[PDB]
Amino acid sequence: GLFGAIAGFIEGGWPGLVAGWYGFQHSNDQGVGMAADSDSTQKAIDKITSKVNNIVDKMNKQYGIIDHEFSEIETRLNMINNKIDDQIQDIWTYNAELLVLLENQKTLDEHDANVNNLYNKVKRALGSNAMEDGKGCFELYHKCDDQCMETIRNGTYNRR
């Protein structure tokens, strides 16, 4: 996709990441484990929650169509009225469908970018103390216990 992370160089998702959309998985002597990154996840949740609300708020306004009665000699008026109704429907249906298709693309790409930004943030912090395995992981050149791992996750890793 656009930012190349999701279903990209980070080939698959993690079923074990239950708390949020983005997170970390570490591996050291003490074992393996993953947890969601609160900062990035909560920020994404607020953004999309807003988009949903604004979409709902911008699109929930109804338009009124009354099934008016026409006499035998009002066939032209009848056709003109149908034209209005048909186009009101076709235009709004078009707006609704396109807004959703187009925004869905942006939503998916934004999640991709958020993953990409998290990854690059860690890459920067680590500096030359690690090498990219090319699959979303960083092979640390030094032993790094849970406390060390935590500094990487909370952005206080020393030697950045």
Partner: protein, 317 residues
Amino acid sequence: DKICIGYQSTNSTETVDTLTETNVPVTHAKELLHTSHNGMLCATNLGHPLILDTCTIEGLIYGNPSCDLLLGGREWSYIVERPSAVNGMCYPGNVENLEELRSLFSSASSYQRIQIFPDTIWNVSYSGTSSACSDSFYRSMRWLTQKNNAYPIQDAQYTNNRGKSILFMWGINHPPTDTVQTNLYTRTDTTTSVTTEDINRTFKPVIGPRPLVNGLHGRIDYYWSVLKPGQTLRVRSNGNLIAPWYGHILSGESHGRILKTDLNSGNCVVQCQTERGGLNTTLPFHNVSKYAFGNCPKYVGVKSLKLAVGLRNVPAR
């Protein structure tokens, strides 16, 4: 030792579409299209609908003798004309500008009858009836006919002092023969006029047999108009006039709909009503009907409008 960045994957079967791809698997999505209704006719925020099961709107307005239950007036959010409503104009004849009349009426939210011309004012007979009308007649008008073989010129007046517009009705009878014309009006050549400060209508009869309808060869052409506050209605006739008797005071504004269905009605209240049923929802769209009215979402002709919330769902395995 290593640290990896990753993203969530779930067992969600939700999918959404984009312009460059369709059925994209997503971890979370929100359906924006409401597609359910209760299959009933209910009350809306404006109240209960006026359900006409035996009488058509014009039948009610003209006071067809079979619509007495409606004589006391009603108020409604919207109108429902069951397919069974067949009592309209019992005596053969047509209503001029029927669509406008039905539209004007349905747009109000209530009506209340008001007497325009009391039976006493006439110097001719006023209780004419017909078998086509349940051996009776309309409660909105009086079929004036000769009394004692005399039909003096009738000249009555009514001034709207109710401070509200009055919808009034009248008709012009067209006898099937010259004999019947004379037996009823004493003369074959008459002149009737209905006037106010704004209107100035006059009518002349045309005797002759029309095709059978409700067993009669004769006809009554029906008319209507609106006496505004302060205006004065005046009717003059020397025969053939079907005089205004009672009028209606229309008030308020309803949803202004006329649903023609036999859909079951229930003891319920909804935000949004359609001819197929009602519904309540906070979703922005619905696909129930473009005729929806009340407090409604926007109608859209589709089966689904699924918005992506989460990210692309990618199975690790």
